[PDB]
Protein backbone atom coordinates (compact mmCIF):
# COMPACT_ATOMS: atom_id res chain seq x y z
CA UNK A 1 0.00 0.00 0.00
CA UNK A 2 2.95 2.34 -0.61
CA UNK A 3 2.12 5.67 -2.34
CA UNK A 4 5.41 6.06 -4.19
CA UNK A 5 8.84 4.60 -4.73
CA UNK A 6 11.97 6.38 -5.94
CA UNK A 7 14.85 4.21 -7.15
CA UNK A 8 18.46 5.07 -7.88
CA UNK A 9 19.46 2.20 -10.14
CA UNK A 10 22.93 1.45 -11.48
CA UNK A 11 24.53 -1.37 -13.38
CA UNK A 12 27.86 -2.42 -14.75
CA UNK A 13 28.34 -5.13 -17.39
CA UNK A 14 31.42 -7.13 -18.45
CA UNK A 15 33.04 -7.74 -20.88
CA UNK A 16 31.04 -4.94 -22.51
CA UNK A 17 32.24 -2.30 -20.03
CA UNK A 18 28.77 -0.76 -20.12
CA UNK A 19 27.44 1.16 -17.16
CA UNK A 20 24.22 2.95 -16.32
CA UNK A 21 23.13 5.34 -13.59
CA UNK A 22 19.51 6.50 -13.42
CA UNK A 23 16.70 7.62 -11.11
CA UNK A 24 13.27 6.05 -11.42
CA UNK A 25 10.00 7.31 -9.97
CA UNK A 26 7.01 4.91 -9.87
CA UNK A 27 8.51 3.15 -12.90
CA UNK A 28 9.34 6.20 -15.03
CA UNK A 29 12.90 7.49 -15.66
CA UNK A 30 13.50 10.88 -14.06
CA UNK A 31 16.98 11.17 -15.55
CA UNK A 32 20.12 9.18 -16.33
CA UNK A 33 23.77 10.09 -16.68
CA UNK A 34 25.18 9.83 -20.21
CA UNK A 35 28.42 7.80 -19.82
CA UNK A 36 29.83 9.16 -23.11
CA UNK A 37 29.13 12.83 -22.42
CA UNK A 38 29.33 12.57 -18.60
CA UNK A 39 26.23 14.75 -18.22
CA UNK A 40 22.81 14.52 -16.61
CA UNK A 41 20.07 13.85 -19.17
CA UNK A 42 16.52 14.58 -17.97
CA UNK A 43 13.85 12.31 -19.42
CA UNK A 44 11.61 15.36 -19.76
CA UNK A 45 13.25 18.76 -20.34
CA UNK A 46 11.11 20.65 -17.76
CA UNK A 47 12.68 18.55 -15.03
CA UNK A 48 16.03 20.15 -15.76
CA UNK A 49 14.70 23.66 -15.25
CA UNK A 50 13.60 22.79 -11.75
CA UNK A 51 16.09 20.24 -10.40
CA UNK A 52 19.79 19.56 -10.51
CA UNK A 53 22.12 16.60 -10.19
CA UNK A 54 25.91 16.39 -10.15
CA UNK A 55 26.82 14.02 -12.99
CA UNK A 56 30.32 13.54 -11.58
CA UNK A 57 29.04 11.63 -8.53
CA UNK A 58 27.38 9.01 -10.74
CA UNK A 59 30.63 8.30 -12.56
CA UNK A 60 32.30 7.66 -9.24
CA UNK A 61 29.50 5.25 -8.37
CA UNK A 62 30.00 3.50 -11.74
CA UNK A 63 33.70 3.04 -10.96
CA UNK A 64 32.63 1.43 -7.69
CA UNK A 65 30.01 -0.72 -9.53
CA UNK A 66 32.70 -1.99 -11.90
CA UNK A 67 34.98 -2.88 -8.98
CA UNK A 68 32.16 -4.73 -7.24
CA UNK A 69 31.34 -6.70 -10.40
CA UNK A 70 34.93 -7.99 -10.73
CA UNK A 71 34.95 -9.03 -7.09
CA UNK A 72 31.63 -10.88 -7.47
CA UNK A 73 32.68 -12.43 -10.78
CA UNK A 74 35.69 -14.08 -9.11
CA UNK A 75 33.81 -14.84 -5.95
CA UNK A 76 31.11 -16.75 -7.88
CA UNK A 77 33.82 -18.62 -9.76
CA UNK A 78 32.92 -16.82 -13.00
CA UNK A 79 29.25 -17.86 -13.01
CA UNK A 80 27.86 -15.98 -16.05
CA UNK A 81 24.37 -14.51 -16.36
CA UNK A 82 21.57 -16.54 -17.89
CA UNK A 83 20.16 -14.75 -20.94
CA UNK A 84 16.44 -13.94 -20.61
CA UNK A 85 14.92 -12.94 -23.95
CA UNK A 86 12.64 -9.91 -24.18
CA UNK A 87 8.92 -9.69 -24.70
CA UNK A 88 8.32 -7.13 -27.44
CA UNK A 89 5.17 -5.12 -28.15
CA UNK A 90 4.56 -2.33 -30.67
CA UNK A 91 1.76 0.16 -30.08
CA UNK A 92 0.84 3.73 -30.83
CA UNK A 93 0.79 6.61 -28.43
CA UNK A 94 -2.85 7.44 -29.23
CA UNK A 95 -5.67 6.23 -31.50
CA UNK A 96 -4.62 6.34 -35.12
CA UNK A 97 -6.00 9.00 -37.42
CA UNK A 98 -4.78 8.63 -40.98
CA UNK A 99 -2.48 11.43 -42.09
CA UNK A 100 -2.29 12.86 -38.50
CA UNK A 101 1.08 12.73 -36.64
CA UNK A 102 1.46 9.95 -34.09
CA UNK A 103 4.14 7.88 -32.36
CA UNK A 104 4.98 4.16 -32.57
CA UNK A 105 6.26 2.74 -29.29
CA UNK A 106 8.45 -0.36 -29.20
CA UNK A 107 7.98 -1.76 -25.69
CA UNK A 108 10.70 -4.22 -24.69
CA UNK A 109 10.21 -6.01 -21.39
CA UNK A 110 11.49 -8.61 -18.95
CA UNK A 111 14.99 -9.23 -20.30
CA UNK A 112 18.62 -9.45 -19.20
CA UNK A 113 21.51 -8.68 -19.69
CA UNK A 114 20.78 -5.03 -20.61
CA UNK A 115 22.04 -5.10 -24.18
CA UNK A 116 19.76 -4.89 -27.20
CA UNK A 117 20.01 -3.83 -30.82
CA UNK A 118 16.81 -2.10 -31.88
CA UNK A 119 16.03 -1.00 -35.43
CA UNK A 120 12.86 0.67 -36.70
CA UNK A 121 11.91 -0.60 -40.19
CA UNK A 122 9.54 1.27 -42.51
CA UNK A 123 8.54 -0.93 -45.44
CA UNK A 124 11.62 -3.03 -44.73
CA UNK A 125 14.06 -0.11 -44.65
CA UNK A 126 15.74 1.37 -41.56
CA UNK A 127 14.49 4.76 -40.42
CA UNK A 128 16.25 7.01 -37.88
CA UNK A 129 14.46 10.34 -38.22
CA UNK A 130 13.17 11.68 -34.93
CA UNK A 131 13.64 8.30 -33.22
CA UNK A 132 14.42 8.24 -29.52
CA UNK A 133 14.67 5.84 -26.62
CA UNK A 134 14.86 5.45 -22.89
CA UNK A 135 17.75 3.81 -21.12
CA UNK A 136 17.22 0.45 -19.45
CA UNK A 137 14.56 0.70 -16.72
CA UNK A 138 14.86 -1.49 -13.62
CA UNK A 139 12.28 -4.14 -12.67
CA UNK A 140 11.62 -5.80 -9.30
CA UNK A 141 12.68 -9.19 -10.67
CA UNK A 142 15.98 -7.51 -11.66
CA UNK A 143 15.31 -7.86 -15.35
CA UNK A 144 15.02 -4.75 -17.54
CA UNK A 145 12.44 -2.75 -19.49
CA UNK A 146 13.15 -0.36 -22.42
CA UNK A 147 11.15 1.87 -24.81
CA UNK A 148 11.95 3.00 -28.33
CA UNK A 149 9.97 5.62 -30.22
CA UNK A 150 9.28 6.48 -33.87
CA UNK A 151 7.23 9.59 -34.74
CA UNK A 152 5.34 8.83 -37.91
CA UNK A 153 2.46 9.85 -40.11
CA UNK A 154 -0.10 7.03 -40.25
CA UNK A 155 -1.11 5.89 -43.71
CA UNK A 156 -2.72 2.79 -45.25
CA UNK A 157 0.37 2.54 -47.46
CA UNK A 158 3.20 1.87 -45.00
CA UNK A 159 4.10 -1.05 -42.75
CA UNK A 160 6.41 -0.89 -39.74
CA UNK A 161 8.46 -3.32 -37.65
CA UNK A 162 10.49 -2.96 -34.51
CA UNK A 163 13.44 -5.33 -35.03
CA UNK A 164 14.96 -6.45 -31.75
CA UNK A 165 18.14 -8.47 -31.28
CA UNK A 166 19.14 -9.99 -27.91
CA UNK A 167 21.47 -12.83 -26.95
CA UNK A 168 18.52 -14.73 -25.46
CA UNK A 169 16.75 -14.88 -28.83
CA UNK A 170 17.48 -17.48 -31.52
CA UNK A 171 16.88 -15.00 -34.31
CA UNK A 172 16.09 -11.29 -34.58
CA UNK A 173 12.53 -10.64 -33.39
CA UNK A 174 10.41 -8.44 -35.69
CA UNK A 175 7.31 -6.96 -34.07
CA UNK A 176 4.97 -5.66 -36.76
CA UNK A 177 2.57 -2.74 -37.00
CA UNK A 178 0.32 -1.56 -39.81
CA UNK A 179 -3.00 0.27 -39.86
CA UNK A 180 -6.09 -1.89 -39.58
CA UNK B 1 18.52 15.42 -6.22
CA UNK B 2 21.27 13.69 -4.22
CA UNK B 3 22.69 10.18 -4.66
CA UNK B 4 23.70 7.46 -2.22
CA UNK B 5 27.31 6.37 -2.61
CA UNK B 6 28.12 2.90 -3.87
CA UNK B 7 29.99 0.87 -1.25
CA UNK B 8 32.97 -1.25 -2.28
CA UNK B 9 32.56 -4.95 -1.53
CA UNK B 10 34.76 -6.87 0.92
CA UNK B 11 37.80 -8.25 -0.86
CA UNK B 12 38.02 -11.71 0.75
CA UNK C 1 29.19 -12.94 -29.89
CA UNK C 2 29.06 -15.80 -27.40
CA UNK C 3 31.36 -14.49 -24.68
CA UNK C 4 29.83 -15.01 -21.21
CA UNK C 5 28.41 -11.93 -19.51
CA UNK C 6 28.69 -10.86 -15.91
CA UNK C 7 26.28 -8.27 -14.52
CA UNK C 8 26.23 -6.08 -11.43
CA UNK C 9 23.36 -3.91 -10.22
CA UNK C 10 22.91 -1.57 -7.32
CA UNK C 11 19.53 -0.17 -6.29
CA UNK C 12 18.56 2.28 -3.59
CA UNK C 13 14.80 2.18 -3.18
CA UNK C 14 12.90 4.76 -1.13
CA UNK C 15 9.35 3.54 -0.38
CA UNK C 16 6.90 6.19 0.79
CA UNK C 17 3.66 5.69 2.74
CA UNK C 18 1.15 8.39 3.73
CA UNK C 19 3.10 11.24 2.14
CA UNK C 20 6.48 11.02 3.89
CA UNK C 21 5.16 9.99 7.30
CA UNK C 22 6.48 6.47 6.80
CA UNK C 23 9.59 5.89 4.72
CA UNK C 24 11.45 2.66 4.08
CA UNK C 25 14.83 2.53 2.37
CA UNK C 26 16.03 -0.62 0.61
CA UNK C 27 19.62 -0.80 -0.61
CA UNK C 28 20.38 -3.82 -2.78
CA UNK C 29 23.32 -5.42 -4.54
CA UNK C 30 22.45 -7.87 -7.31
CA UNK C 31 24.83 -10.14 -9.16
CA UNK C 32 23.41 -11.33 -12.48
CA UNK C 33 19.84 -12.01 -11.33
CA UNK C 34 20.44 -12.75 -7.65
CA UNK C 35 20.32 -10.19 -4.86
CA UNK C 36 23.33 -10.84 -2.61
CA UNK C 37 23.25 -8.30 0.21
CA UNK C 38 20.82 -5.61 1.39
CA UNK C 39 20.33 -2.76 3.84
CA UNK C 40 16.71 -2.46 4.97
CA UNK C 41 16.06 0.57 7.18
CA UNK C 42 13.38 -1.41 8.99
CA UNK C 43 16.13 -3.84 10.00
CA UNK C 44 18.89 -1.34 10.68
CA UNK C 45 21.97 -3.21 9.47
CA UNK C 46 23.15 -5.06 6.38
CA UNK C 47 21.93 -8.64 5.80
CA UNK C 48 23.25 -11.21 3.37
CA UNK C 49 20.56 -12.51 1.06
CA UNK C 50 22.64 -15.19 -0.66
CA UNK C 51 25.80 -16.89 0.67
CA UNK C 52 28.02 -14.83 -1.62
CA UNK C 53 26.90 -11.66 0.20
CA UNK C 54 28.02 -12.79 3.64
CA UNK C 55 31.48 -11.15 3.60
CA UNK C 56 30.05 -7.78 2.53
CA UNK C 57 27.40 -7.64 5.24
CA UNK C 58 30.00 -8.58 7.89
CA UNK C 59 32.48 -6.02 6.60
CA UNK C 60 30.03 -3.12 6.28
CA UNK C 61 28.29 -3.83 9.58
CA UNK C 62 31.63 -3.43 11.36
CA UNK C 63 31.83 0.21 10.32
CA UNK C 64 29.85 2.51 12.64
CA UNK C 65 30.06 5.49 10.27
CA UNK C 66 28.45 3.60 7.39
CA UNK C 67 25.67 2.24 9.57
CA UNK C 68 24.93 5.70 10.93
CA UNK C 69 24.84 7.25 7.42
CA UNK C 70 22.58 4.46 6.16
CA UNK C 71 20.27 4.72 9.19
CA UNK C 72 19.78 8.47 8.75
CA UNK C 73 19.38 8.08 4.98
CA UNK C 74 15.58 7.83 5.15
CA UNK C 75 15.91 11.54 6.09
CA UNK C 76 19.02 12.84 4.30
CA UNK C 77 18.29 10.87 1.12
CA UNK C 78 14.70 9.61 0.73
CA UNK C 79 12.75 12.50 2.32
CA UNK C 80 15.13 15.02 0.79
CA UNK C 81 14.68 13.73 -2.77
CA UNK C 82 10.93 13.40 -2.36
CA UNK C 83 10.89 17.02 -1.23
CA UNK C 84 13.00 18.52 -4.03
CA UNK C 85 11.28 16.33 -6.64
CA UNK C 86 7.73 16.67 -5.30
CA UNK C 87 6.30 19.32 -7.64
CA UNK C 88 7.07 17.50 -10.87
CA UNK C 89 6.72 13.84 -9.89
CA UNK C 90 4.45 13.21 -6.89
CA UNK C 91 2.23 16.13 -7.81
CA UNK C 92 2.35 15.62 -11.58
CA UNK C 93 -1.16 15.48 -13.05
CA UNK C 94 -2.01 15.33 -16.76
CA UNK C 95 -5.60 15.00 -17.86
CA UNK C 96 -6.51 11.97 -20.01
CA UNK C 97 -7.76 12.35 -23.58
CA UNK C 98 -10.87 10.20 -23.88
CA UNK C 99 -12.21 8.86 -27.17
CA UNK C 100 -14.86 6.24 -27.92
CA UNK C 101 -15.29 4.26 -31.14
CA UNK C 102 -16.56 0.88 -32.35
CA UNK C 103 -13.76 -1.57 -33.03
CA UNK C 104 -15.47 -2.47 -36.30
CA UNK C 105 -18.32 -1.18 -38.38
CA UNK C 106 -21.07 -3.69 -37.60
CA UNK C 107 -24.84 -3.43 -38.05
CA UNK C 108 -27.10 -2.83 -35.09
CA UNK C 109 -27.97 -5.94 -33.07
CA UNK C 110 -24.67 -7.52 -34.10
CA UNK C 111 -21.93 -8.18 -31.51
CA UNK C 112 -19.23 -5.51 -31.45
CA UNK C 113 -16.46 -4.09 -29.29
CA UNK C 114 -16.99 -0.52 -28.15
CA UNK C 115 -13.57 0.93 -27.40
CA UNK C 116 -12.97 3.59 -24.76
CA UNK C 117 -9.49 4.85 -25.38
CA UNK C 118 -8.07 6.81 -22.48
CA UNK C 119 -4.65 8.20 -23.26
CA UNK C 120 -1.87 10.63 -22.32
CA UNK C 121 -2.60 10.72 -18.58
CA UNK C 122 -0.61 10.87 -15.35
CA UNK C 123 -0.53 9.43 -12.80
CA UNK C 124 -1.51 5.81 -13.39
CA UNK C 125 -4.34 5.51 -10.86
CA UNK C 126 -7.60 5.73 -12.82
CA UNK C 127 -11.13 4.35 -12.98
CA UNK C 128 -12.87 3.66 -16.27
CA UNK C 129 -16.47 2.48 -16.21
CA UNK C 130 -19.01 1.72 -18.94
CA UNK C 131 -22.74 2.54 -18.78
CA UNK C 132 -25.59 1.46 -21.02
CA UNK C 133 -28.51 3.88 -20.85
CA UNK C 134 -27.21 5.25 -17.51
CA UNK C 135 -26.64 1.80 -16.00
CA UNK C 136 -23.25 0.36 -15.13
CA UNK C 137 -22.14 -2.54 -17.30
CA UNK C 138 -20.00 -4.84 -15.17
CA UNK C 139 -19.84 -7.80 -17.56
CA UNK C 140 -18.27 -8.00 -21.01
CA UNK C 141 -15.55 -5.45 -20.19
CA UNK C 142 -12.25 -6.28 -21.91
CA UNK C 143 -9.41 -4.09 -20.60
CA UNK C 144 -5.73 -3.80 -21.49
CA UNK C 145 -5.12 -2.61 -17.96
CA UNK C 146 -2.64 0.21 -17.40
CA UNK C 147 -0.08 0.76 -20.13
CA UNK C 148 3.07 2.72 -19.31
CA UNK C 149 4.29 4.71 -22.33
CA UNK C 150 7.76 5.41 -20.86
CA UNK C 151 7.38 9.16 -21.32
CA UNK C 152 5.54 10.03 -18.07
CA UNK C 153 2.15 9.22 -19.58
CA UNK C 154 -0.11 6.15 -19.45
CA UNK C 155 -2.90 4.93 -21.65
CA UNK C 156 -5.55 2.23 -21.40
CA UNK C 157 -8.15 0.68 -23.71
CA UNK C 158 -11.31 -0.41 -21.98
CA UNK C 159 -13.56 -2.23 -24.43
CA UNK C 160 -17.21 -3.17 -24.00
CA UNK C 161 -18.84 -6.22 -25.66
CA UNK C 162 -22.12 -4.91 -26.95
CA UNK C 163 -25.14 -5.96 -28.87
CA UNK C 164 -26.32 -2.38 -29.50
CA UNK C 165 -29.99 -1.61 -30.21
CA UNK C 166 -31.53 1.42 -31.89
CA UNK C 167 -31.47 4.50 -29.68
CA UNK C 168 -29.11 3.13 -27.00
CA UNK C 169 -26.57 5.45 -25.39
CA UNK C 170 -23.28 4.06 -24.14
CA UNK C 171 -21.12 6.13 -21.83
CA UNK C 172 -17.46 5.77 -20.93
CA UNK C 173 -16.88 7.46 -17.58
CA UNK C 174 -13.39 8.31 -16.36
CA UNK C 175 -12.27 9.22 -12.84
CA UNK C 176 -8.72 10.50 -12.39
CA UNK C 177 -6.88 12.80 -9.93
CA UNK C 178 -6.43 15.38 -12.73
CA UNK C 179 -10.15 16.29 -12.75
CA UNK C 180 -12.58 17.16 -9.95
CA UNK C 181 -15.56 15.65 -11.81
CA UNK C 182 -15.69 12.46 -13.93
CA UNK C 183 -14.93 12.76 -17.64
CA UNK C 184 -17.68 11.30 -19.81
CA UNK C 185 -17.86 10.42 -23.48
CA UNK C 186 -20.98 9.02 -25.09
CA UNK C 187 -21.52 6.78 -28.08
CA UNK C 188 -25.04 6.70 -29.50
CA UNK C 189 -26.35 3.74 -31.44
CA UNK C 190 -27.99 5.20 -34.58
CA UNK C 191 -31.80 5.48 -34.54
CA UNK C 192 -33.01 3.14 -37.31
Residue numbers in the entry:
A (entry chain A): 2 to 181
B (entry chain C): 308 to 319
C (entry chain B): 2 to 193
Copy text verbatim from the article accompanying this structure deposition.
Cell surface presentation of antigenic peptides by major histocompatibility class II (MHCII) molecules to CD4+ T cells plays a pivotal role in the adaptive immune response to foreign pathogens. Accordingly, MHCII:peptide complexes are extremely long-lived with half-lives of days to weeks, and empty MHCII molecules rapidly lose their ability to re-bind peptide. MHCII molecules anchor peptides through a conserved network of hydrogen bonds and a series of pockets within the peptide-binding groove. Further studies demonstrated that DM not only acts on MHCII:CLIP complexes but can promote the exchange of any peptide.
